[model samples]
Target: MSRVQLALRVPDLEASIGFYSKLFGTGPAKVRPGYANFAIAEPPLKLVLIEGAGEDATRLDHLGVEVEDSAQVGHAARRLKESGLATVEENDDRVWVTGPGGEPWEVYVV
Candidate 1:
């Protein structure tokens, strides 16, 4: 995996976007009606912002580590399982695992 990815739901798109833009020191690379994404290089991260209900604003949608290819996904899944992490599931797009604290993590190829 190369970069870490996180998707967050926000109640107000414009405000959240402005905040992240200042925090990241750059605007999103892509934007649409209810979504925006920033591909940050300095710290290697993909930040996805999506508009949703207020109750869901502070909840994490998911976390992912971007891999180069399918083989890497398989390798990551295997390694996690071998380490006794209990990879929950895997499919063509990504592999899912849970942290020791029950935080969801994903190995995604995109």
Candidate 2:
């Protein structure tokens, strides 16, 4: 696999984007309605900013949000497949299984 990713939930998308962009000094590579990711490196430097409802934003951290919406899901799955990592049983939003770690780990989706 090229690499995996991590999405740290933040209350402020625009603000957080500013903070991280400057933190990485690379700005965001992709942006959407309420999401964004940094283009830090080839495959290892994967990061996302997801802002939505105040519903336990911390929970979203247990799993990494790698794709944008339905559009990115297809590409995300394919990359996982070809990248030799893959491949979880794609869920509602597509995912890579978290290896049955029911404790706190779960499928990294969306």
Candidate 3:
């Protein structure tokens, strides 16, 4: 299944994590020094919290489309490029793309 992903830039990772964990009723599925991701099964949401985004850090970090496999990611990348949108391969499993309004998007295989 494809899931809508929301990544938010935060000034304090720990505080954000705590707030979301309480709100979601669970902790994140994964965590790193500057990042954490939540997989909320009941709500079917993918929430990512990121630290150190500089000023205006409370804004969106980026948007993402999460898929089950690499082929899906490739398909999204191809479709975006076909539409004349510039897409950059962030890694083997993800592509970074920009929308018409300059919003960043990531098509990624999770």
Residue pairs with backbone overlap in model 2: none
Best by lDDT: 3
lDDT of 1 by residue, 1-110 (tens): 38999988788888889999999899999999898999998889999888886563556777889978888888888898898876765574688987777778888887
What ranking of all candidate models by lDDT puts the best one first? 3, 1, 2
**For residues 5-91, could you state the per-residue lDDT of candidate 2 as single tens digits?**
667677778888999878777779899978897867644557778886576453455445444465566676676678676366545
Candidate 2 lands at a TM-score of 0.55
RMSD of 2: 7.0
Model 3 CA deviation exceeding 4 Å by range:
53-57
**lDDT (tens digit, per residue) of candidate 3 on 1-110:** 88889999898899899999999899999999999999988788799999975665577879998999999998998998998888898674998988778789898988
Q: lDDT of each model, Cα atoms only?
A: 0.84, 0.63, 0.88
TM-score attained by model 3: 0.86
